[PDB]
Design a protein around this nucleic acid. Structure first.
Ligand SMILES: [Zn+2]
Ligand SMILES: [Zn+2]
Lengths: 98, 119, 30, 203, 56, 286, 56, 56, 49, 214
DNA sequence: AGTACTTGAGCT
RNA sequence: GACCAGGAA
DNA sequence: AGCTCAAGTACTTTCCGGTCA
């Protein structure tokens, strides 16, 4: 289409860094039967950990990209029902603006 | 069902009959742990399943913009603020009953006029 | 897409494997 | 096609529908369960107490297999526990001891016990039950529909006239079998499996 | 022409209602499946059929 | 008015036509239809974002059909001939007792429904009860053999470390992460098997990525530079005492955007073709 | 379509095109019409090939 | 005819058998495809005949 | 009430070729699919050089 | 009581068809003999408890007058019903000698469940006599009475030689019916035998056709 | 492009 | 001329 | 070891720019 563009491809780490720095328990130290509702956080299909207040994490992320702090071409989705937080940074994603 | 593991092994427990006293035991097969059972129910199939009907009702359900609204007032907090979905059991036979969730009280009710639930 | 390949990717490929027993450092594009 | 006589008799058509449409024990079953009930004469499950006090009065496993049947499904397929049981009863003959609640009773239940190691035996018996036990119907005949087709036919006075009949439409084929069913018309029976026709009826 | 137009719009309109109903009906679990069809398979049959009656 | 975005190879203007492909590192569950011993499968096509790009697929299967018993769960591992009962994999990763293994797979201890369908898996792996004997059981299944008790065991490590779930980490101390993920796959598997979640739409545009001229060239230069990397490795072995062939990398690219057969070089079938093509100039919009 | 709320079994959501060609399609109507149309072109180009081999 | 190393013989045996095979058919099931230096596989006589284009 | 985003303009679901078809929202769906292929066989000024 | 009589009606629906078949082969069976009522059938072949006596159902058959014209060498026929579900070389061996001693030309065993491969061996063992096995369950409906199943007619050698002549044909060129063909089995077709098939035509009204036996 | 037959290999 | 690739009633 | 199968294979219209000895 006319507004369609494609992800050039960026880097995860400034997110991964930022993410754990904003309340992400690493998978190393997960124990589900203890926090069994933790929204589990993904980045480029890599499971990194979990977050107990995903609603407010989401805010921080969404504000980061909208402010330009996280790259406008990065893709972040909260699937509340399923309790997951998927993030993509990789090249190849077709996107539009709204 | 509701089954447990052996303290010591944390391995799964398999039923064994205490023939002499007429009782069911669960025993470990990695050590000698044994316990009297909790219930006579050992195995359960369930072919017409109602479990998964209302999956993922996290406390954030209200913050899903995709989900639709209604002003059908709650059974509890008589609130005309709620979000609703159909049975999240992705089976074929499945009815188009709706499931409502109170934005204030968070209690789950339905549009059923055949049956009376609490989930 | 191309831009990014030149600016970044091209460097990356030159030295992700590379070095022998001879190493490859920075790359220059005319 | 219906027997020449009962051509408009719908209850005849319903009768055959139910005589050939496949029904399995699985299709009426809510859940199976395996209980440890050590004494045959008395049951841990309280609701089942009635069922024993009767189907006993007016040696066998302590491991119980329990079946709950869906009331609704039991009528869409037009079924009584009695006939359901008798099937099971006759599937395993003399090595499964069987009891059931009445169509009366508030829950639809079937109790089953065999005749070291017994609880895995049962779990096998439960799949023989659910998978390969038939209640009504001829195998392969999955849905069956009634349709009132218009049929042109000579009136007693000469003229051809719309003189419609009930007709059975099948999802699935078993020619050799549904052909020898009573109450149908064997001389008009048809299928889109000409492969099948070739095999029964000649080339 | 004008009237035939308006009159079409209501022909559609009423069948939109016909559907809304069978929908509500199937949402309250009042609706009964036809022989061989899902509760759902049955529902859609009415809807699709209502909307084609409409168009026609 | 020229908008550019093309190449000029030997005079004629070439366009690189964007290539569509399934995204990788993505978890998808599918029902394997009627005639199969398998009933549902959880795949992930996993690869390094760049760096030799491992095209190892992790398949995780649910044997037994919706009618059988012994609905067991095995998974095909890279470089390993047989499918392995998941439990063994867990123990091969250090997660040893039942239920510590179950805890990775099911985060609710009231989902008796999901748990039941794990009981058989447990019985399956029951026969191997510690890490090293699960490593051996894995290593016995080559490849071949490697016929040596100590060798097949240090083989298995190697696979779990490098070939299995190769994103996440190819380094070392991350059995935790890899085991937890394998669980997440098994969860996502039993989920669809329980009519709870839906089978993945293989046509969802979201799980597709489009390779443009950038990524396209990168795949090529990568292949080409590593051809030259090991040309040098020979004029260095020759000199048992600066002639590094500059033509490879020029005339390599040339060949591709020339023919549109995207593969080094003249030995290029299968390769992909019509990746590049002469630019239409009939009409400006055209 | 992401312009709709969930579990929308209405005619508008599932691709009933209310409008005449004279009045012109809404963007939703347009896209669904498109979806349907593409299915046409495919099984045209299909029934072509299949028809051919059959004839041969 | 020379000093036959009795395996280097069955070496060239196999090799002859191969060319005389792939001269008539080159698209054989059992792997490799006798290919021209260039990559382009050689044109078996069989290949000239299998039709819709092709002799018959 | 739950809106998150707005479409900038529906007409941008369209591609280049299609964006030349006038009133395409008044056409049988494939009549568009043709012209959005035929216009690529038309004639005119392709570049000013 | 139960579901007993339905296996009786079946056995009678089958008996009839056999009677029909035998007649159609060109044997002497009165029409009424075919049309035996279920009522009659019961009381004649049923014991002390009204349970079907198949041993007594068996019967011999003779060619019609006309049949002896067209096929002079058509012998007499025996049709035996066994009372045992499975049928073994035990009962089979006796049956076979019955036919070799009374010099029947053809003999037809109607069996309930199966005939043991043991017994199955005794079948071609007494030429020139030919022996046919028929599953009782098959013979319940007479397939030849179906809508779609047109008149098949066995041709005499003389009849055939003429067909071949008048159309200048090698047997190769004739359309063929398989030997195991349901109608071929009904008519007791042996390989080489030709049937003439008369069907109705939406184009000509009636239409001649021939198939030869494989 | 879905079905054909036919090859192939793995499991009990 | 092989071969590959792309586009038409 | 053999014997069963599922999963493997190849095969099924008229017109009008590049690289290969
Ligand atoms: Zn223990
Ligand atoms: Zn409320």
């Amino acid at each position: 289409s006319l507004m369609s563009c494609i992800s050039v491809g960026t880097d995860p780490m400034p997110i991964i860094t930022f993410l754990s720095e904003w309340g992400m328990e690493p998978l190393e130290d997960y124990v589900p039967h203890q926090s069994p509702d933790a929204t589990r956080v993904f980045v480029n299909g890599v499971w990194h950990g979990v977050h107990r207040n995903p609603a407010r994490l989401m805010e921080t992320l969404r504000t980061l990209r909208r402010k330009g702090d996280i790259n406008p071409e990065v893709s972040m989705i909260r699937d509340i029902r399923e309790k997951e937080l998927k993030i993509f940074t990789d090249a190849g994603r077709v996107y539009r603006p709204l | 069902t509701t089954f447990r593991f052996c303290r010591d092994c944390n391995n799964m427990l398999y039923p064994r009959e205490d023939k002499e006293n007429n009782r069911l035991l669960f025993e470990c097969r990695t050590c000698s742990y044994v316990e009297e059972a909790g219930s006579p129910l050992v195995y359960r199939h369930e072919l017409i399943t109602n479990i998964g009907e209302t999956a993922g009702v996290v406390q954030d359900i209200g913050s899903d913009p995709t989900l639709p609204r209604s002003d059908r007032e709650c059974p509890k907090c008589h609130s005309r603020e709620n979000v609703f979905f159909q049975s999240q059991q992705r089976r074929k036979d499945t009815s188009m009953v709706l499931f409502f969730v109170c934005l204030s009280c968070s209690h789950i009710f339905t549009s059923d006029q055949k049956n009376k639930r609490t989930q | 897409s191309f831009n990014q390949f030149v600016d970044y990717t091209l460097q990356d490929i030159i030295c992700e494997d590379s070095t022998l027993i001879i190493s490859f450092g920075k790359i220059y594009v005319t | 096609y219906l027997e020449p006589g009962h051509a408009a008799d719908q209850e005849q058509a319903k009768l055959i529908r139910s005589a050939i449409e496949h029904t399995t024990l699985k299709s009426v079953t809510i859940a199976s369960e395996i209980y440890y009930d050590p004494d045959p004469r008395s049951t841990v499950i309280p609701e089942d107490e009635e069922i024993i006090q009767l189907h006993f009065s007016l040696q066998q496993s302590p491991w119980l297999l329990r079946l709950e049947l869906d009331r609704a499904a039991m009528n869409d397929k037009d079924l009584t526990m009695g006939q359901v049981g008798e099937r099971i009863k006759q599937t395993f003959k003399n090595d499964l001891f069987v009891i059931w609640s009445e169509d009366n009773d508030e829950k639809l239940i079937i109790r089953c016990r065999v005749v070291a190691e017994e609880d895995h035996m049962l779990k096998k018996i439960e799949n023989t039950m659910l998978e390969n036990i038939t209640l009504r119907g001829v195998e392969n005949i999955e849905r069956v529909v009634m349709m009132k087709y218009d049929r042109k036919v000579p009136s007693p006075t000469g003229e051809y006239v719309k003189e419609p009949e009930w007709v059975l439409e099948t999802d699935g084929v078993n020619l050799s079998e549904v052909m020898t069913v009573p109450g149908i018309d064997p001389t008009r029976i048809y299928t889109n499996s000409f492969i099948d026709i070739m095999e029964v009826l000649g080339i | 022409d004008g009237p035939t137009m308006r009159e079409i719009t209501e022909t559609i309109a009423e069948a939109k209602k016909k559907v809304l109903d069978v929908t509500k009906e199937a949402q309250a679990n009042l609706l009964t499946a036809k022989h061989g069809m899902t509760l759902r398979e049955s529902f859609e049959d009415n809807v699709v059929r209502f909307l084609n009656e409409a168009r026609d | 008015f020229d908008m550019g975005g093309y190449f000029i190879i030997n005079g004629s203007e070439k366009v690189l036509i964007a290539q569509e492909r399934s995204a990788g590192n993505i978890v998808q569950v599918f029902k394997k239809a009627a005639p199969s011993p398998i009933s549902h499968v959880a795949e992930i096509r996993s690869a390094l974002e760049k760096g030799s790009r491992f095209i190892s697929t992790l398949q995780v299967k649910l044997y037994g059909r919706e009618g059988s018993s012994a609905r067991t769960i095995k998974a095909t591992l890279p470089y390993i001939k047989q499918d392995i009962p998941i439990v063994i994999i867990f123990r091969a990763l250090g997660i040893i007792p039942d239920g510590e293994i179950l805890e990775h797979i099911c985060y609710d201890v009231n989902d008796w429904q999901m748990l039941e369908m794990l009981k058989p898996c447990v019985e399956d792996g029951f026969v191997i009860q510690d890490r090293e004997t699960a490593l051996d059981f894995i290593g016995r299944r080559g490849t071949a053999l490697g016929i040596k008790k100590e060798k097949r065991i240090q083989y298995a490590k190697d696979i779990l470390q490098k070939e299995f779930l190769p994103h996440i980490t190819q380094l070392e101390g991350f059995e935790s992460r890899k085991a937890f993920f394998l669980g997440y796959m098994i969860n996502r598997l039993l989920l669809c098997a329980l009519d709870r979640k839906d089978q993945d739409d293989r046509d969802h545009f979201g799980k597709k990525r489009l390779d443009l001229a950038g990524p396209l060239l990168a795949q090529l230069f990568k292949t080409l530079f590593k051809k030259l990397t090991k040309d040098i490795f020979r004029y260095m072995q020759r000199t048992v005492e600066l002639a590094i062939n500059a033509k490879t990398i020029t005339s390599g690219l040339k060949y591709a955007l020339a023919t549109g057969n995207w593969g080094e070089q003249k030995k290029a079938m299968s390769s992909r073709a019509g990746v590049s093509q002469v630019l239409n100039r009939y009409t400006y919009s055209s | 379509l992401p312009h709709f709320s969930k579990d929308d079994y209405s005619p508008e959501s599932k691709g009933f095109v209310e409008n005449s060609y004279l009045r012109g399609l809404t963007p939703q109507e347009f896209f669904f019409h498109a979806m349907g149309g593409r299915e046409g072109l495919i099984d045209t180009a299909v029934k072509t090939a299949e028809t051919g081999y059959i004839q041969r | 005819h020379n000093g036959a190393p009795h395996h280097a013989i069955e070496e060239a045996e196999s090799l002859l058998q191969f060319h005389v095979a792939t001269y008539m058919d080159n698209d054989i099931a059992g792997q490799p495809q006798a290919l021209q230096k260039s990559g382009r596989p050689v044109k078996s006589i069989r290949a000239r005949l299998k039709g819709k284009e092709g002799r018959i | 009430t739950t809106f998150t985003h707005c479409e900038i303009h529906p007409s941008m679901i369209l591609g280049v070729a299609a964006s030349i078809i006038p009133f395409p929202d008044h056409n049988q769906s494939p009549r568009n699919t043709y012209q959005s292929a035929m216009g690529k066989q038309a004639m005119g000024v392709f570049l000013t050089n | 009581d139960q579901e007993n009589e339905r296996n009786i009606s079946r056995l009678w629906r089958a008996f009839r068809t056999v009677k029909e078949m035998v007649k159609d082969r060109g044997y002497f069976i009165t029409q009424e003999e075919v049309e035996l009522p279920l009522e009659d059938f019961k009381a004649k072949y049923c014991d002390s408890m009204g349970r079907p006596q198949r041993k007594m159902m068996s019967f011999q058959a003779n060619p019609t007058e006309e049949s002896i014209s067209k096929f002079p060498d058509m012998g007499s026929l025996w049709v035996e019903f066994c009372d045992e579900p499975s049928v073994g070389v035990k009962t089979m061996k006796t049956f076979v000698i019955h036919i070799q001693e009374k010099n029947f030309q053809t003999g037809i065993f109607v069996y309930q469940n199966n005939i043991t491969p043991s017994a199955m061996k005794l079948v071609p063992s007494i030429p020139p006599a030919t022996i046919e096995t028929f599953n009782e369950a098959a013979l319940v409906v007479n397939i030849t009475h179906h809508e779609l199943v047109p008149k098949h007619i066995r041709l005499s050698s003389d009849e055939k030689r003429e067909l071949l002549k008048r159309y200048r044909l090698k047997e190769s060129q004739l359309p063929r019916i398989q030997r195991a063909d349901p109608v071929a089995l009904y008519l007791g077709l042996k390989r080489g035998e030709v049937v003439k098939i008369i069907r109705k035509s939406e184009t000509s009204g009636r239409y001649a056709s021939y198939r030869i036996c494989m």
